[PDB]
Design an enzyme around this catalytic site. Structure first.
Site, PDB file in Angstrom:
ATOM      1  N   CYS A 133       6.540  41.360  80.660  1.00 48.57           N
ATOM      2  CA  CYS A 133       7.715  40.730  81.275  1.00 48.57           C
ATOM      3  C   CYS A 133       9.023  41.369  80.824  1.00 48.57           C
ATOM      4  CB  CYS A 133       7.737  39.237  80.981  1.00 48.57           C
ATOM      5  SG  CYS A 133       8.007  38.844  79.240  1.00 48.57           S
ATOM      6  N   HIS A 147       8.833  34.763  77.279  1.00 54.47           N
ATOM      7  CA  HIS A 147       8.956  35.235  78.650  1.00 54.47           C
ATOM      8  C   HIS A 147      10.404  35.540  78.982  1.00 54.47           C
ATOM      9  CE1 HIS A 147       7.504  36.141  82.617  1.00 54.47           C
ATOM     10  NE2 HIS A 147       8.456  35.401  83.161  1.00 54.47           N
ATOM     11  N   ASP A 198      11.967  37.477  88.931  1.00 54.61           N
ATOM     12  CA  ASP A 198      10.967  37.758  87.907  1.00 54.61           C
ATOM     13  C   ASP A 198       9.974  38.742  88.500  1.00 54.61           C
ATOM     14  OD1 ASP A 198       9.157  37.750  85.855  1.00 54.61           O
ATOM     15  OD2 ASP A 198       8.759  35.592  85.894  1.00 54.61           O
TER      16      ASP A 198
END
Lengths: 340, 340
Positions: free
Chosen positions: A106, A154, A169
């Site tokens: 991420c 995250h 994202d």
């Protein structure tokens, strides 16, 4: 020796900015078709378009969709690598993702994407969140702890378009929302049919607050895998705040997920690309390597593509299926106990 | 083997609570004089007093003052320890601080104190922050990066008294506010004469915000070491948000500060207790071991107490000056490269 400099957010004049040419090379790594090359180039020529919903959101939708389908969500740097260290430097990330056609997790995906979007003219805040234990690959953790969340691990982006923030994202493989979403309490959308996604502002189950007068609320991102069920079940995926996270925060978070032995990323090899229906402009499934097995999921149907027998098979499979290419040193750096 | 359970915040019925007798034993470890034993006992008998400012704040002031003077801020678990891992379990912390009369860093101290305060009836939120690089023991980091902050690495508490949250922190040695402070923008107070403390809600230097319309603000704790100067200089110490942090967040944060080789805690032995004027009910200085040398500072005056020559000298000094007692295994666990 003692450090003389620690990780920081550079002053504005010193930050990495991807040039118009480097962004064009990124559009080609994304394999944009002509209409989205044209869309990207119109923003390259007029960055003011990146501030509006009407002109900035369509390119943002296209970028995020092709990014998760063509940039792998992968942890190979912790395995097929001689050093097993994660860099979050935006220039090195550019080389990894555009030039080498590799990917990461991420923080590598969304630090890169944030740098690209700001370079295109978007207003972008780096934010932080916690992955739900409902996503854990450990079965007893899923069964007993699905209402809990990991410690900060995250990264996502907030992108400001017109008068509203959007969550963005591209760094969570098939678990991610895989769509720019308006930062709206109660937003729901189909995303990778039949799956639905939902955004809610709510308190999480873990709290010391003794009552509502003292409770806090987070943004919670949940999915519904099968909305056709008589009673919809929502599975938590991650929660986050609007607080601006810094490069050195991600460095802390990534150190844990990359070196703490209870992080599954230190234990197993994984690599994911999403699958697009380009003409319908939607993602329809994912290809995922987990340990030794590649599986293709399309909607609710999943099938095994390959169970690799040998190191040579897995390495060739990374090239042919994922366009993940390893140097000689990276192949030979896999610890013996992880080889096939 | 794969984990079957990850760190979480337990459900309210499964959380560690310190009994009335355990809290009494804490008050004795604090070395409360009779008037504060009386005050503590009155809250043990009527927990509703911990909800008010008029009855909850005085005990809170006394607890925090005696805690930082009597519970050491220390990192010996990373050095004089066979395993060199940090537990944040509130029961093990109780045994460490009350029974063993040892201490720890920000998360060990403030997890313990939060558990104790909630057991006395206080409403307490665990919060997270970033230590300023102006506090770095690395000279070049201090000189070039003082406007920046570490990745998430500090814990403090918010305590709700009456209609107002208070910041509470007994886990930062001499750098801490060393006073409960009202969570008010612009609050200033004398704390350890001549030093003043200040609380401001403001943006920090490091931001991707291109302008104030998209900027975020943090709670910022600064100090003024010398308010007598013609132009007051404020030194940043830490910044934080009101977000509720979880045990697993602190686990991430502590993992970085306890295992990343750029954390100074992994490199050097350190131990601090504050110094009280008990009758005047104020803190006036500190005793600090750093590497091999103990210094006493009272206000703005600092002097060397002892520069230890041998391991035996440092170990006896820890007993005599800091009441820090080591087991034989702890003494013999110090790596050879760190011995005197």
């Amino acid at each position: 020796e003692d450090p003389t400099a620690l990780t920081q957010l550079p002053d504005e004049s010193a930050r990495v900015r991807y040039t118009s040419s480097e962004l064009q090379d990124y559009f080609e790594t994304l394999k944009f078709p002509q209409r989205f090359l044209d869309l990207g180039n119109s923003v390259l020529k007029d960055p003011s378009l990146a501030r509006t919903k009407e002109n900035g959101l369509p390119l943002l939708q296209a970028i995020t969709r092709y990014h998760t389908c063509n940039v792998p969500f992968e942890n190979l740097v912790l395995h097929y690598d001689p050093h097993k260290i994660v860099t979050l430097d935006p220039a090195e990330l550019y080389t990894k993702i555009v030039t080498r056609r590799r990917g990461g997790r991420c923080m590598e995906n969304n630090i890169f994407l944030g740098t690209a979007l700001r370079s295109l003219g978007y207003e972008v805040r780096n934010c932080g969140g916690r992955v739900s234990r409902a996503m854990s690959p450990y079965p007893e953790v899923r069964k007993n702890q699905s209402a809990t969340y990991d410690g900060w691990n995250h990264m996502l982006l907030l992108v400001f378009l017109g008068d509203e923030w959007y969550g963005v994202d591209v760094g969570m493989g098939s678990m991610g929302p895989n769509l720019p979403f308006p930062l709206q309490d109660g937003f729901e959308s189909l995303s990778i049919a039949p799956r639905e996604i939902r955004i809610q502002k709510r308190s999480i189950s873990e709290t010391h607050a003794t009552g509502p007068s003292h409770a806090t609320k987070m943004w919670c991102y949940d999915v519904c895998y099968n909305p056709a069920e008589s009673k919809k079940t929502w599975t938590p995926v991650y929660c986050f705040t609007e607080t601006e996270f810094l490069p050195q925060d991600y460095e802390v978070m990534s150190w844990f997920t990359s070196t703490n032995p209870r992080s599954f990323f230190t234990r197993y090899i994984t690599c994911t690309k999403m699958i697009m229906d380009e003409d319908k402009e939607v993602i329809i499934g994912n290809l995922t390597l987990f340990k030794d097995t590649v599986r293709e999921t399309i909607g609710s149907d999943r099938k095994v593509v390959k169970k690799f027998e040998t190191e040579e098979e897995r390495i060739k499979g990374l090239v042919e299926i994922f366009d993940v290419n390893l140097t000689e040193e990276e192949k030979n750096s896999l610890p013996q106990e992880k080889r096939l």
